[PDB]
Amino acid sequence: GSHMPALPIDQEFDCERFRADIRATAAAIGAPIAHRLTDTVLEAFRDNFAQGATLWKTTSQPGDQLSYRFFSRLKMDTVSRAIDAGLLDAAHPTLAVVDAWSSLYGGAPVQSGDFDAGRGMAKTWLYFGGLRPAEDILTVPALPASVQARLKDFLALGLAHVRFAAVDWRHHSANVYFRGKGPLDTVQFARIHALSGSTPPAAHVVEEVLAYMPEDYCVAITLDLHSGDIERVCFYALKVPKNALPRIPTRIARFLEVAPSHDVEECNVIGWSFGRSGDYVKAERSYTGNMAEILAGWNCFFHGEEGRDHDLRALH
């Protein structure tokens, strides 16, 4: 239009440019778009995106959603806000576990938000504020007996501290984020992979995941919140530079190429997800608000850096 403003090219979060980039990136990777829903998310959580690290995610699954996420600096009840805005059932059965988890340690945990371009509110992510004993997370009364039962299987693998938990609002499951004292080796990999029910992989799949883990490693476990079944596990490598990337699916290569990053220090994340329904690769990519800074503040370890958790080692 005859004096329509140019979308900025600088680093600072701009909401109108975000809307355009969500649309462009969904199109670029062949993902679905929900215009109205996307506008509702952007209106409800504008400040969260502005003040946190806003970033992208997808998986190598064909046609999978283009997701967009805020990692929070502004601490507030994002779940209540989601419900106010019409983005989440007020009767969702996972609300009780999310409130329990959020209320721990006198309310220290901080919620972040994970959305899909085609489907709206996807996940609520909880940073718990340090290395929490797995017990504290897996034995809140809101969790049924069959979920709390899994505690002992985790402790038996030396997966004894939890750093994050992410509730999936379509599937009444949670991804629980552990840090193990490593190095991660072949046998520890196999014992973790075995939880998923996935067919054992060839030796080079494992060798490659092991080459990209920090010494003290982060692994997410997908837990059905009714049955306690484990569907999936996922091993993460954070801030992998483009010239050091592992072998990736062409869909992930495309994603990393087309999704824009405006951060001073670019941040790509690669997850190797293994699961009974099929393996895949997850990718995340920085957009605005300094993803790397948030992750370092959480005491995450970056590819190529020392990767030793001293506090953890004093506890084990």
Ligand SMILES: *[C@@](O)(Cc1ccc(O)cc1)C(=O)O
């Ligand atoms: C894990 O790698 C989990 C993880 C994965 C992606 C992002 O962005 C943050 C955290 C960890 O280091 O705790």
